């Protein structure tokens, strides 16, 4: 890792085998004795949407769905399906800048969700520092997928012109997986 890497506790990340079923990485099927939530980062234009199903009883990701270019309505429909598959799991939705259609459709489709708008660097810092702490404590468990692990590895610290800390992907990379995971783990106790 670089000097400015955010996830200094990557060595304590638990790596889980999975089956790739289309856009889903399935670690395990629904356990009805457990309670789940889903961290949801939507894709605005050609950005990736990522939905991370977290078993709140074990702290392990059960399923992660990722794609780009899906229509807004299809993103909501895929989220509905995931929620229903995991016992009407509640969605932690980053509602910031998603547009009226997704917001309206979450309600119109009766999706079980709570808003967590990632509306500033301060909110992002809260989410990320919680994920990083849980990770160092050996409480984060994710599909053992190189794309996921690489996005975590390449998440780094930078300073703005005003001196404020920001966190983002190295180079010209993506962080939708990082954010989806952080949205899920925001609920984990
Ligand atoms: Mn994103």
* Listed resolution, Å: 1.2
The Cβ-side half-sphere exposure at 146, using a 13 Å CA radius, reads 0
- Ligand 1 centroid from CA 91, angstroms: 16
Structural biology method used? X-ray
- Ligand 1 centroid from CA 151, angstroms: 12
Residues 110 and 95: their CA atoms lie apart, in Å, by 16
Judge contact between 86 and 57, C-beta under 8 A: no
- Ligand 1 centroid from CA 119, angstroms: 13
Structure tokens at 6: 């955010």
* For helices 176-185 and 146-153, angle between their N-to-C axes, nearest 10 degrees: 90
- Ligand 1 centroid from CA 74, angstroms: 16
Q: Let me know if domain 1-189 sits in CATH 3.30.420.240.
A: yes
- Ligand 1 centroid from CA 110, angstroms: 23
């Amino acid at each position: 890792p670089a000097m400015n890497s955010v996830f200094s506790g990557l060595d304590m990340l638990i790596l889980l085998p999975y089956e790739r079923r289309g856009t889903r990485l399935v670690v395990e099927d629904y356990r009805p004795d457990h309670i789940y939530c889903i961290g949801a980062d939507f894709g605005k234009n050609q950005d990736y949407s990522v939905f991370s199903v977290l078993d709140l009883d074990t702290g392990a990701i059960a399923c992660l769905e990722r794609m780009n270019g899906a229509t807004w309505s299809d993103q909501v429909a895929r989220l509905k399906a995931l929620s229903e598959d995991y016992g009407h799991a509640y969605v932690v939705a980053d509602t910031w800048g998603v547009g009226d259609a997704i917001a309206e459709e979450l309600d119109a489709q009766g999706i079980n969700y709570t808003p967590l708008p990632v509306k500033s660097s301060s909110v992002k810092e809260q989410l990320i520092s919680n994920l990083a702490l849980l990770m160092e404590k050996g409480q984060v468990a994710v599909p053992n997928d190189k794309t996921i692990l690489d996005e975590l590895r390449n998440f780094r610290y930078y300073r703005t012109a005003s001196g404020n800390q920001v966190m983002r992907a190295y180079g010209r990379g993506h962080d939708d997986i990082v954010m989806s995971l952080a949205l899920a783990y925001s609920q984990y106790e």
